């Protein structure tokens, strides 16, 4: 009767039941195993004995023997919701592989013989949840990020576009930049704190050459965080320098087009006569997404480069740090989600190509 | 599909709906024009040539599952009707002329609406 929603985050799993605000289960979503395994937490608990792996890499599943202790973790550990009594709705990245699709579909049919599933792009149920049928999802999580066009409730295929530049190198390349200062983070453990700091601390600015010059004028831009041990470490332009590697991968070594970049030219792959729907409806998903002033700033870049007739608005909603679990959630609780779902009858006598 | 669905774009008219609990529910006539700030709203403008307009209305107070249902259920009902209806999406305060023309007494909001399903 009531469906359990499962987001497969590259950094972190987010599961609860259809009808919530929001996801009641977040984890990381890690492996470890000896030297029986062990999953999210725990296994970061375990560091000493453990060899941690991310089964899902920018947003694919690559690691199945993995990714099935996170999905039982998810149901037993977490939920305490058997599997087979349930409907179970199940996010994917955009441009998931067919492969990866029909491979998750047997997985839940065949190893936890779901009743009923049904699979939806995270970026599609984002902007549902913005209350729209119509606009781009720019989606940064931690493992990857995308620009989604979605007309009259569809992506548009032809228009998405992948970016690895996500949250996970962010919080590496303010792991490096801290350097600077005579900070030695690289383990593990430390790169969770570092994580933390750039959660509490960064943010993206509005214009960045002006921002270095007012930085460098004062100390106001120096703010504090109590590490785990009780030392106070202190962090200055690192603050925005961090994230600005969103807009200027190059920062990275990378050769990739920013996030503003991205979403114009997945603007410009759609045919002229929606585009106005489109730069009018830039939806924000995804935890990397959660700086301050990054709508701001992904406005005043956009708007340079999009035609000057142009109406530019980006929308940053308070909840979009879950809204793709949020989307989930609403849809698997509609009264017509009945007849959407793929029912274990059905696969067994079709396959996992009924997914399709 | 859906018993409401089952009715939906049959002849030319002016059909709405709100969102309740995760449901669309008809609205009652009587009270068509006068739209709670608290809660979204679907409607559907059949004309005779069928041609098919939706819209969805958001009320500036209305929850985030009033407002995802009402998106979805455009969408779902698009589909039914096999994709030939243009979907709009209205604003509280912010609405297309042509959405405020299928009201002969104008766009009218009431304080309140709805519970939200979560
Ligand atoms: N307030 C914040 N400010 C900046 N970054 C944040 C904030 N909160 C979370 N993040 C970052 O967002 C990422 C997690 O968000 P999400 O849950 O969107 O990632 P995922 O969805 O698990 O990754 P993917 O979606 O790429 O598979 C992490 O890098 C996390 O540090
Ligand atoms: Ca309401
Ligand atoms: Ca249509
Ligand atoms: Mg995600």
Redesign the interface.
Known sequence: VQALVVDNGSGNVKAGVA???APRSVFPSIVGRPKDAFVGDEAQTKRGILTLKYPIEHGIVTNWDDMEKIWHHTFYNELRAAPEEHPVLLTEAPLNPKANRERMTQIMFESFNVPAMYVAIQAVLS????????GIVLDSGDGVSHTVPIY???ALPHAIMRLDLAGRDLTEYLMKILHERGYGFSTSAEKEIVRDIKEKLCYIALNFDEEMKTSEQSSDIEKSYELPDGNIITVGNERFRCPEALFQPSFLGKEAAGIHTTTFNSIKKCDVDIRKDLYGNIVLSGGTTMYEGIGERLTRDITTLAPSTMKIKVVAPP?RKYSVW??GS??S????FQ?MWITKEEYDESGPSIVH | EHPEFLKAGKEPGLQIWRVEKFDLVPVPPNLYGDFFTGDAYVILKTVQLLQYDLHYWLGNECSQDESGAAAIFTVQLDDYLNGRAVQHREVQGFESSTFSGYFKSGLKYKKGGVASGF
């Open positions: 009808g919530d605000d902007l549902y949840s913005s209350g729209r049928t119509t009259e409730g569809y909840e949020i989307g609403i849809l609780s509609l009264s017509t007849q």
